[PDB]
Scaffold this active site. Structure first.
Site, PDB file in Angstrom:
ATOM      1  N   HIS A  92      10.291  14.125   0.613  1.00  0.00           N
ATOM      2  CA  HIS A  92      11.073  13.933   1.836  1.00  0.00           C
ATOM      3  C   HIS A  92      12.504  13.605   1.436  1.00  0.00           C
ATOM      4  CE1 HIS A  92       9.806   9.934   0.608  1.00  0.00           C
ATOM      5  NE2 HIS A  92      10.999   9.578   1.055  1.00  0.00           N
ATOM      6  N   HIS A  94      16.333  11.369   2.607  1.00  0.00           N
ATOM      7  CA  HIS A  94      17.097  10.433   3.453  1.00  0.00           C
ATOM      8  C   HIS A  94      18.520  11.001   3.540  1.00  0.00           C
ATOM      9  CE1 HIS A  94      13.888   7.285   2.854  1.00  0.00           C
ATOM     10  NE2 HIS A  94      13.698   8.035   1.775  1.00  0.00           N
ATOM     11  N   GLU A 104      20.062   6.420  -0.613  1.00  0.00           N
ATOM     12  CA  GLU A 104      19.495   5.066  -0.654  1.00  0.00           C
ATOM     13  C   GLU A 104      19.997   4.384  -1.937  1.00  0.00           C
ATOM     14  OE1 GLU A 104      15.174   5.425   0.382  1.00  0.00           O
ATOM     15  OE2 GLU A 104      16.086   4.728   2.342  1.00  0.00           O
ATOM     16  N   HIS A 117      13.231  12.441  -2.389  1.00  0.00           N
ATOM     17  CA  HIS A 117      12.224  11.626  -3.062  1.00  0.00           C
ATOM     18  C   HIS A 117      10.970  12.476  -3.248  1.00  0.00           C
ATOM     19  CE1 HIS A 117      14.283   7.672  -1.568  1.00  0.00           C
ATOM     20  NE2 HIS A 117      14.822   8.142  -2.687  1.00  0.00           N
TER      21      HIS A 117
HETATM   22  N1  LIG Z   1      11.086   6.276   0.518  1.00  0.00           N
HETATM   23  S1  LIG Z   1       9.895   6.201  -0.595  1.00  0.00           S
HETATM   24  O1  LIG Z   1       9.952   4.901  -1.235  1.00  0.00           O
HETATM   25  O2  LIG Z   1       9.844   7.377  -1.466  1.00  0.00           O
HETATM   26  C1  LIG Z   1       8.354   6.207   0.285  1.00  0.00           C
HETATM   27  C2  LIG Z   1       8.270   5.394   1.410  1.00  0.00           C
HETATM   28  C3  LIG Z   1       7.103   5.375   2.133  1.00  0.00           C
HETATM   29  C4  LIG Z   1       5.998   6.134   1.707  1.00  0.00           C
HETATM   30  C5  LIG Z   1       4.742   6.130   2.525  1.00  0.00           C
HETATM   31  O3  LIG Z   1       3.768   6.806   2.141  1.00  0.00           O
HETATM   32  C6  LIG Z   1       4.724   5.297   3.819  1.00  0.00           C
HETATM   33  S2  LIG Z   1       3.178   5.518   4.779  1.00  0.00           S
HETATM   34  C7  LIG Z   1       2.086   4.563   3.876  1.00  0.00           C
HETATM   35  N2  LIG Z   1       0.808   4.671   4.303  1.00  0.00           N
HETATM   36  C8  LIG Z   1      -0.131   3.919   3.638  1.00  0.00           C
HETATM   37  C9  LIG Z   1       0.260   3.008   2.632  1.00  0.00           C
HETATM   38  C10 LIG Z   1       1.618   2.995   2.227  1.00  0.00           C
HETATM   39  N3  LIG Z   1       2.518   3.739   2.870  1.00  0.00           N
HETATM   40  C11 LIG Z   1       6.106   6.895   0.547  1.00  0.00           C
HETATM   41  C12 LIG Z   1       7.310   6.977  -0.158  1.00  0.00           C
HETATM   42 ZN   LIG Z   2      12.135   8.017   0.477  1.00  0.00          ZN
END
Ligand SMILES: NS(=O)(=O)c1ccc(C(=O)CSc2ncccn2)cc1
Ligand SMILES: [Zn+2]
Length: 258
Positions: A92, A94, A104, A117
């Protein structure tokens, strides 16, 4: 009244539902390039995306996720600072409302227009949901985007975005090759941190590439036409979905170069 990127529910509020927001290993951070230590013991990063199987793209109300088949060892990250093997689950971005902000991580306080990311989980934990409960559960490869030349390998993502304009929309997105999003050099910084959205879990080895990719103004303008709202709700453009730099506290950022 759930978390988001505003006014009233943005980064500065997240600590009330997720107290780890004020924890000891939160991300992102500013990378002060002069105080990052070169570590000759770091290995070249090994990115093996030749068999990656993308499945679908999803507007989750915060960003869009391109999701992969992670049920076999097909798209993996290893080497670098990592012990063992990490499997790609999703990527994904930002980004900002303007070209001067959106990343970020920052580099000597410089903001890039966006940040990609690529999220991977440690196979020793069997799946993503168990891996996020462990301090070495995830490895996130972060890549900066600046506005200049187009990125041809990004165009197939840009073109599908009008089909997932609003929160909760998804579309088939097969045969997407994430190698087309990588810069030429794999020189990197690395440090221990966290997810940058709730639940903010302190489970990530961050690997941030030094070399940004270039995307065109037209490509990033299409990101900014997405919406945080669902269909039939008033339009809230999906922009500025980044968390600012957090305190480094008791952490060392290591460089694979110099
Ligand atoms: N922005 S990031 O740090 O790459 C990032 C941020 C959030 C996630 C998610 O998977 C959020 S949803 C999620 N669901 C269950 C347990 C933990 N997170 C994954 C990557
Ligand atoms: Zn991210």
């Amino acid at each position: 009244h759930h978390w988001g990127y505003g006014k009233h529910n943005g980064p500065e509020h997240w600590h009330k539902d997720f107290p780890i927001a004020k924890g000891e290993r939160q991300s992102p951070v500013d990378i002060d390039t002069h105080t990052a230590k070169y570590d000759p013991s770091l290995k070249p990063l090994s990115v093996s995306y030749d068999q990656a199987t993308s499945l679908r793209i999803l507007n989750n109300g915060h960003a869009f996720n391109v999701e992969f088949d992670d049920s076999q060892d097909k798209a993996v990250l290893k080497g670098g600072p990592l012990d063992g093997t990490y499997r790609l689950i999703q990527f994904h971005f930002h980004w900002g409302s303007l070209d001067g902000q959106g990343s970020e991580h920052t580099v000597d306080k410089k903001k890039y227009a966006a940040e990609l990311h690529l999220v991977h989980w440690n196979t020793k934990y069997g799946d993503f949901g168990k891996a996020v409960q462990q301090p070495d559960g995830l490895a996130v490869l972060g890549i900066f985007l600046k506005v200049g030349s187009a990125k041809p390998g990004l165009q197939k993502v840009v073109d599908v975005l009008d089909s997932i304009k609003t929160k909760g929309k998804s579309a088939d997105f097969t045969n997407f090759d994430p190698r087309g999003l990588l810069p030429e050099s794999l020189d990197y910084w690395t440090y221990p941190g966290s997810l940058t959205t709730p639940p903010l879990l302190e489970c990530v080895t961050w690997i941030v590439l030094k070399e940004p990719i270039s995307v065109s103004s037209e490509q990033v303008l299409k990101f900014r036409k997405l919406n945080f709202n669902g269909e039939g709700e008033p339009e809230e453009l999906m922009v500025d979905n980044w968390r600012p730099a957090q305190p480094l506290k008791n952490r060392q950022i290591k460089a694979s170069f110099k």
